[PDB]
Design a protein around this nucleic acid. Structure first.
Ligand code: CA
Ligand code: CA
Lengths: 244, 244
DNA sequence: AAAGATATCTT
DNA sequence: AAAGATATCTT
């Protein structure tokens, strides 16, 4: 399917190619930075061509946002089915060692999930799926990457800012956790778990209806949450009390 | 000086090279996206080797943050002058048509400017200068040719997501404005003016002491600024009255 | 954890 | 503008 073909293409492309720099039209190469900020940009650009290639094989148009603070990264849709749009968003995180627990931020809990047209390319009720493409890289220990430039014959001398990178495709609701991923920017937190848990889809929500309801009523601070719910157990108890 | 040599080298490099993609160690090239999240990253990486080359000719050490979430991008200093450190930060913004008015976010007003060791590589009082390397680009809409991968022999055929990149080097206090650059992430706002105003330093503050005092006492919300000051005129009146 | 830093944009 | 979106990290 579109999903199985996209997952296989992403696994493959990642296995084959290691991004190592930015290149000018003149052929001069500038090495990469160490932060997640440079690597989440690089992972998004890396996935673009793949997503477009797989979508075209399946008859889906691909549209990126026109505005800069909108979701999702990629909107897939057949022109004959306007309300079967698929949302694909790329998220990234790091580990210091290969097998520790990781976690992502999964977008806002106060924007398009509470308002049908807030910060989103198409009305939220036109989407039938919300997929996360998750990248995880292991930081290199060196905090002094290269400060020189390179030519096309020195490609294999360029220090890579990661040791290993893994990628998965999973539904957003399935890997969603019950604790905020950020405070002032109010992001859904994902589960806090090993990499295999995201691939396998071992979450905490019983359904996408429960995931949406949880995040739609989650309070912005601890103070407010202490009178309602802080976690999935307290949310289920809030449901028993009659949403009060 | 360090400064004059730095801006000549930045301006020259901008003029002679055009970034057009991310390259892998295998040689495959991925085209660029058109938003500031991508261009911000590319301009930082492009400037890194230039900053280090010029810094080294003046006998300055270049140190980058060891942790994410810390200012500044580049800390320059001599072993003989440890309390005369120079902070350099790269800021980027865009324009829809060449030469319209622009504005930048200049860093938090609630971190290192109010707490000497908050979110900064070195205590804030060891720095004697805070420079901004400002990048401005005109946005160019992505087309179909940006959605595939390229080989090195097609470098000059890759479509760029930008045009007319301009760069300046200026003191943070000199280009600082009196209105916040962001709400929930409490950043200082720069003046709102044309590129030449930034080059020439036509800001609203009379001194770096006034800049600092203004942003150290600026309240986070309009509700609170209503009773204090919202702009330079109100701040100067408040000061005239005895800070009340 | 919770809350607020890191940079910039939109309405 | 002011206020809160865009991603993700630290503490
Ligand atoms: Ca996104
Ligand atoms: Ca910075």
């Amino acid at each position: 399917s579109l999903r199985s073909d996209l997952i296989n293409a992403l696994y493959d492309e990642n296995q084959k190619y290691d991004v190592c720099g930015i290149i000018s039209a003149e052929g001069k190469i500038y090495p990469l930075g160490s932060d997640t900020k440079v690597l989440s940009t690089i992972f998004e650009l890396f996935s673009r061509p793949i997503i477009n290639k797989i979508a075209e094989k399946h008859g889906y148009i691909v549209e990126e946002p026109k505005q800069q603070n909108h979701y999702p990264d990629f909107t897939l849709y057949k022109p004959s089915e306007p309300n079967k749009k698929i949302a694909i968003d790329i998220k990234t995180t790091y580990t210091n060692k290969e097998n520790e627990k990781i976690k992502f931020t999964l977008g806002g809990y106060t924007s398009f999930i509470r308002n049908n047209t807030k910060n989103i390319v198409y009305p939220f009720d036109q989407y039938i799926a919300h997929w996360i493409i998750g990248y995880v890289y292991t930081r290199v220990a060196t905090r002094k990457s290269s400060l020189k430039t390179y030519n096309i014959n020195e490609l294999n001398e360029i220090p890579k800012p990661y040791k290993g990178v893994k990628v998965f495709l999973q539904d957003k609701w399935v890997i969603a956790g019950d604790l905020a991923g950020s405070g002032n920017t109010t992001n859904i937190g994902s589960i806090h778990a090993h990499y295999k848990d995201f691939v396998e889809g071992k979450g905490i929500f019983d359904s996408e209806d429960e995931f949406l309801d949880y995040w739609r009523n989650y309070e912005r601070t601890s103070q407010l949450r202490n009178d309602k719910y802080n976690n999935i157990s307290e949310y289920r108890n809030w449901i028993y009390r009659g949403r009060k």
